[PDB]
Design a protein around this nucleic acid. Structure first.
Ligand SMILES: [Mg+2]
Ligand SMILES: [Mg+2]
Ligand SMILES: [Mg+2]
Ligand SMILES: [Mg+2]
Ligand SMILES: [Mg+2]
Ligand SMILES: [Mg+2]
Ligand SMILES: [Mg+2]
Ligand SMILES: [Mg+2]
Ligand SMILES: [Mg+2]
Ligand SMILES: [Mg+2]
Ligand SMILES: [Mg+2]
Ligand SMILES: [Mg+2]
Ligand SMILES: [Mg+2]
Ligand SMILES: [Mg+2]
Ligand SMILES: [Mg+2]
Ligand SMILES: [Mg+2]
Ligand SMILES: [Mg+2]
Ligand SMILES: [Mg+2]
Ligand SMILES: [Mg+2]
Ligand SMILES: [Mg+2]
Ligand SMILES: [Mg+2]
Ligand SMILES: [Mg+2]
Lengths: 53, 147, 136, 128, 225, 187
RNA sequence: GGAGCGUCGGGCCCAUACCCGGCCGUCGCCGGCAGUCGAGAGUGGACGGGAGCGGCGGGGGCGGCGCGCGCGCGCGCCCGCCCCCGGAGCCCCGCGGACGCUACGCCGCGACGAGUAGGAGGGCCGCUGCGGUGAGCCUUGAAGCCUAGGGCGCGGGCCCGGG
RNA sequence: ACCCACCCGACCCGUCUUGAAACACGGACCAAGGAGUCUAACACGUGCGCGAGUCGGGGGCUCGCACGAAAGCCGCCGUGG
RNA sequence: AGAGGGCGUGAAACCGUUAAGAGGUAAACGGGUGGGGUCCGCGCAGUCCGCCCGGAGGAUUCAACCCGGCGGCGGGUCCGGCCGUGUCGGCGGCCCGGCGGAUCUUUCCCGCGCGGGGGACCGUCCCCCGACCGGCGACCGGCCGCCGCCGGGCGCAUUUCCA
């Protein structure tokens, strides 16, 4: 029940959302992995720009 | 910080701050915005005048970038450029007037709030107000349309 | 400043010691062991500190220069006074009063020295006084 | 000939018995430790005649003699020797308690040092 | 520098001591006058009646100016109109009292609080005994006992009232400056009535203690003050 | 038993600042002293303001500080502001001012000093004028905060112009039954 | 011949009410104290000429704004001084300032103090783990446990002794 | 503070209730366990930083992370909010 | 083994016993005293200490003073020099001072009208000396005054210690 003034607000937590929460504890581990993989790809394409084409 | 919160101070007391005549039952009003019309109506129509009902035209595939038109007021037009354009001017003695490309700085329209200092300009912009035009002319300048 | 760093320190210093409804302070060159602004060795541009002598006889006064704090190695300047009690006090008195240095302190500095010269009282004499040791 | 405190006034206490907890007598599960009652009817919590008393700030000690031991001192729980030398400049107003957990060798080391400085100890003749 | 200043400070010191002496002497003469004034008032009321009585006549003396009003019942279950007036007489606690100048307005306010008060026309002695034994100033809103005239003066001296005696004369004659001298006095916290009362709840006329008892308020004053 | 209501016996005003920061607290120590020992009520007002909340000491724009000193007669003075001095990009020519502030933003600082302005701290103001003599005590607009536009007689209460808390403005967020005449009614 | 009923006296009895006093807390005081004169405060101080027992010859006012501990004065000798606290000796000291001043401290005056539901503040109340910190404590005995032992705190609780 | 005596006082708590010592319910006793949490969104208050701006994400550059899945920096500093 | 194979610590309920005390209004409780126990602190006078003083005994070197040395403080002449704030002079760092700029110039250079770099210009940051002023806890050097320590002097109406 609403009590005296406030946004009549609609949250979208009626489905079973806690079954599909996606945490981000990866992200540092991820960020590194990309970065290694990046440095490897440079080293493979030896004098070619790391960039791409 | 649980340490600071209220339930630490309620420990010992029976009702936990929810009273003992009426209690803390689950959902006595109904869940959420239930009763907007019936039984919660007064709150809705004294803090949300106009919740209920349709109005105006539908618009199916709205794409916001078509209507993109960020405005800027004369108020702070000179802010767009380095002070030393506004200084090398009120000086110079050619009656030059420096250009101000407003679209470069990220505003499309030029509306007309504020006093513009007596110091000629050439304002390039996608759109202008009527008043913004007038003020600009009164300074001794020239509005300039750009695509 | 003095006051600024007292704001930083007043409740947090390692030298402080609350407990048992009192508070105290263990920082050196604090005569009276108070967690006070007045009686704080570390904070003030000019400082007094009356420790006992390592000998076991006598007292050391510990002035602070003003020359250069920033350089703690050189900052304090110690001075043993190992004299006939009444004299010791007077030397401390003059150090404090006639140099116009930390005039606020001074009587506290005298009482400290006094208590230190009490300390070096006689331990053996005290033992004799407490127990009569007569007729088993 | 023990260490006299500076001033030995008459401590005067408003209440001597412990406030005990309602129905701590009747039950082994309830402990003496005071608890305010919050019961809707409660002889005690609504101050009837003939019941166990409720502690107020009314019973409070006089500020001069609050925490004053019978001897006239206030405790200060010393933990090692270095910690004593604090009391050096009080001695006439604070005494030294030595801690339970301190060893019987260095209990001794504290006691004789306090005896130099004339700080009264509140549990000296003990560990041995 | 030194001996010039010293003498200047000694001069100052003396000029104070002189003034103190002066104001003391004023106080002393002000009393002496008020002694003569109350004497003259007392006799010249008797004077009058005797002279009416000499003729086949009557001397109806003045209706009283001033009355002491004691709150004689407690602070539970009391009607809102009464309660308001009782806190317009400053009669909040039971057995508080105030002087009150009489007039159509004032008297009727006492009429609306009748079974809550005992009141009437105080004696000279009553005004003295109340002021000397239980005379407390309102001085920066702190009830403070009138230990010296430096207190009374400090507050009421802008009215010509510079001592306990002046105060008593302002209260008793109901002067110009009564409102300000009477409000200065903190309401009189009197003890319980020694020897007891007759009946709290009923009017004087009908045996009890409440209401106007005119002359007899002075007996009650003595057994409470 | 006495009849007083004990209801509004405790006054709710602040005494110290609620902040724990040490430099402000030194200013408070200084202005407590001055407040009590000087007759100047300037010190009292300043002291009072040092205890107030961020909300309660709003920023004073440079243009607002200009125009308040442009006023006739308060010339060769010092403006004082327990809040912060901010820039106005929509003012150009800045006269040479004298200013006290707890803060001045980096732009506002430049503009003033470029003009030949002097900036003072509050410890500096005290030495300069311990009884607040020859000062202009200004304040930022208290009721600037967008907050206040929701305060008052509620929306949907005839003749109120009180912003409702709404998730997002647009055609279909409110503006139906209770604003149009066409839809029920309007207030 | 009331220990009954109606009318009335004195006298005495006691509530957490009233009065005085103590002590605790809360509220209030534009409260006080970062080191100074001062108690209805109603000035202080240069400095220049002219002078001196002169003064400011104003109300039965009973009086506050002016008077009798000195203004000039004792000493050096009509003229000079009327001197400095590293020393006037102090009830006021403006030359420097607590035993006191953790300024979140310390101190002073008043007033007041029922409380369910409920709200807020403070807890050097209590539990477990983390960063700091105690040149902490501990096999010369930690934690826990038990105790007609000693104490502190209004209380949550706490500290010591012995086992 | 252990026990005993005596005078006065004194019904059993919890709870729902206008009203509970109730012939209203729950409760033989002790130990341990045991109930206003976390996430999201809003609003107001307060504290801090910057202020016509502010912002940090997401991404990237710096390390094998002992402490680091931290810390730092970015014409990305502002795509964008 | 007061760790004995379901055995570390070993709480409470509950039970056994041992000791003490009580006992016809179920017990238990609050307030107030009394009696008894348990221990705890004593005292085999607790007359408790500390200043200063007067007297009476006994014992070491001084203090006061100079002299020599060291260290510290404070000061102004800012005296001499280092130090830094505001201002003015050098246009002097300006290219031997860099960044920033929608200020300018493609008279320039290089790379392809644009990019990069010069070159002007403005804003900002640094050298040279003189002058005025805040002479600022930012330091040195001499001189002064004062303090303290060590050692020299001083032998005893002194200055200590002790009873
Ligand atoms: Mg890529
Ligand atoms: Mg609630
Ligand atoms: Mg309930
Ligand atoms: Mg409800
Ligand atoms: Mg009830
Ligand atoms: Mg009644
Ligand atoms: Mg009635
Ligand atoms: Mg209340
Ligand atoms: Mg209450
Ligand atoms: Mg409650
Ligand atoms: Mg129900
Ligand atoms: Mg019912
Ligand atoms: Mg019940
Ligand atoms: Mg029944
Ligand atoms: Mg039921
Ligand atoms: Mg049952
Ligand atoms: Mg549990
Ligand atoms: Mg906020
Ligand atoms: Mg074992
Ligand atoms: Mg076992
Ligand atoms: Mg084990
Ligand atoms: Mg037996």
């Amino acid at each position: 029940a609403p009590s005296r003034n406030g946004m009549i607000l609609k949250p979208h937590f009626h489905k079973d959302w806690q079954r599909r929460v996606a945490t981000w504890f990866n992200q540092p581990a991820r960020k590194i992995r990309r970065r290694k993989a990046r440095q490897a790809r440079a080293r493979r394409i030896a004098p070619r720009p790391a960039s791409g084409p | 910080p649980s340490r600071l919160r209220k339930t630490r101070k309620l420990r010992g007391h029976v009702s936990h701050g929810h009273g003992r005549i009426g209690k803390h039952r689950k959902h006595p009003g109904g869940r959420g915005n239930a009763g907007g019309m019936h039984h919660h109506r007064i709150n809705f129509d004294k803090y949300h005048p106009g919740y209920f009902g349709k109005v105006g035209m539908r618009h199916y595939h709205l794409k916001r970038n078509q209507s993109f038109c960020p405005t800027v007021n004369l108020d702070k037009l000179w802010t767009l450029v380095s002070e030393q354009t506004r200084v090398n001017a009120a000086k110079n003695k050619t009656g030059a007037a420096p250009i101000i490309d407003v679209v470069r700085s990220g505003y499309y329209k030029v509306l007309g709030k504020g006093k513009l200092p007596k110091q000629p300009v050439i304002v390039k912009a996608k759109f202008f107000s009527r008043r913004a035009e007038e003020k600009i002319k009164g300074v001794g300048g020239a509005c300039v349309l750009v695509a | 400043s003095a006051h600024l760093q007292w704001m930083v320190v007043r409740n947090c210093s390692s030298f402080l010691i609350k407990r048992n409804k009192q508070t105290y302070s263990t920082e050196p060159n604090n005569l009276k062991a108070r967690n006070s602004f007045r009686y704080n060795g570390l904070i003030h541009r000019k400082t007094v500190g009356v420790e006992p002598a390592a000998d076991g006889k006598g007292v050391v006064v510990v002035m602070k220069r003003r020359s250069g704090q920033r350089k703690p190695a050189t900052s304090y300047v110690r001075t043993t006074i190992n004299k006939n009690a009444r004299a010791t006090l007077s030397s401390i008195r003059h150090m404090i009063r006639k140099n116009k240095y930390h005039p606020d302190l001074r009587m506290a500095a005298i009482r400290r020295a006094s208590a230190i010269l009490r300390s070096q009282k006689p331990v053996m004499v005290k033992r004799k006084r407490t127990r009569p040791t007569k007729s088993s | 000939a023990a260490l006299r405190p500076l001033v030995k006034p008459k401590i005067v206490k408003k209440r001597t018995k412990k406030f005990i907890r309602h129905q701590s007598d009747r039950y082994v599960k309830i402990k003496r430790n005071w608890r305010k009652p919050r019961g809707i009817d409660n002889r005690v919590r609504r101050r009837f005649k003939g019941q166990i008393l409720m502690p107020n700030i009314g019973y409070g000690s006089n500020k001069k003699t609050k925490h004053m031991l019978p001897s006239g001192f206030r405790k200060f729980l010393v933990h090692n020797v270095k910690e004593l030398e604090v009391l050096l400049m009080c001695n006439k107003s604070y005494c030294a308690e030595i801690a339970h957990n301190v060893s019987s060798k260095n209990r001794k080391a504290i006691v004789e040092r306090a005896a130099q400085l004339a700080i009264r100890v509140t549990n000296p003749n003990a560990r041995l | 520098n030194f001996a010039e200043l010293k003498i200047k400070r000694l001069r100052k010191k003396f000029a104070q001591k002189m003034l103190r002496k002066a104001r003391r002497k004023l106080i002393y003469e002000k009393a002496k006058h008020y002694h003569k004034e109350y004497r003259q008032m007392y006799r010249t009321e008797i004077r009058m009646a005797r002279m009416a009585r000499k003729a086949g006549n009557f001397y109806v003396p003045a209706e009283p100016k001033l009355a002491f009003v004691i709150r004689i019942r407690g602070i539970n279950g009391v009607s809102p109109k009464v309660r308001k007036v009782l806190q317009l007489l400053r009669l909040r606690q039971i057995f508080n009292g105030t002087f009150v100048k009489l007039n159509k307005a004032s008297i009727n306010m006492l009429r609306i609080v009748e079974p809550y008060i005992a009141w009437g026309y105080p004696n000279l002695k009553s005004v003295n005994e109340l002021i000397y034994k239980r005379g407390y100033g309102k001085i920066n809103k702190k009830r403070i006992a009138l230990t010296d005239n430096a207190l009374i003066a400090r507050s009421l001296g802008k009215y010509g009232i510079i001592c306990m005696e002046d105060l008593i004369h302002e209260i008793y004659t109901v002067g110009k400056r009564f409102k300000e001298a009477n409000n200065f006095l903190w309401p009189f916290k009197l003890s319980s009535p020694r020897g007891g009362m007759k009946k709290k709840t009923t009017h004087f006329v009908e045996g009890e203690d409440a209401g106007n008892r005119e002359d007899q308020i002075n007996r009650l004053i003595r057994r409470m003050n | 038993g006495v009849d007083i209501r004990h209801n509004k016996d405790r006054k709710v005003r602040r005494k110290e600042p609620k902040s724990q920061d040490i430099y402000l607290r030194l200013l408070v120590k200084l202005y407590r002293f001055l407040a009590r020992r000087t007759n100047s009520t300037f010190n009292q007002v300043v002291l009072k303001r040092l205890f107030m909340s961020r909300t309660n000491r709003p920023p004073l724009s440079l243009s607002r500080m200009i125009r308040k000193m442009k006023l006739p007669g308060r010339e060769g003075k010092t403006a004082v502001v327990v809040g912060t001095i901010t820039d106005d990009v929509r003012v150009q020519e800045v006269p040479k001012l004298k200013v006290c502030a707890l803060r001045v933003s980096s732009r506002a600082r430049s503009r003033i000093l470029k003009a030949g302005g002097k900036i003072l701290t509050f410890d500096q103001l005290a030495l300069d004028s311990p009884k607040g003599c020859g000062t202009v005590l200004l304040s930022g607009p208290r009721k600037g905060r967008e907050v206040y536009r929701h305060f008052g007689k509620a929306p949907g209460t005839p003749h109120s112009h009180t912003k409702p808390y709404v998730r997002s403005k647009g055609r279909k967020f409110e503006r139906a039954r209770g604003r149009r005449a066409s839809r029920g009614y309007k207030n």
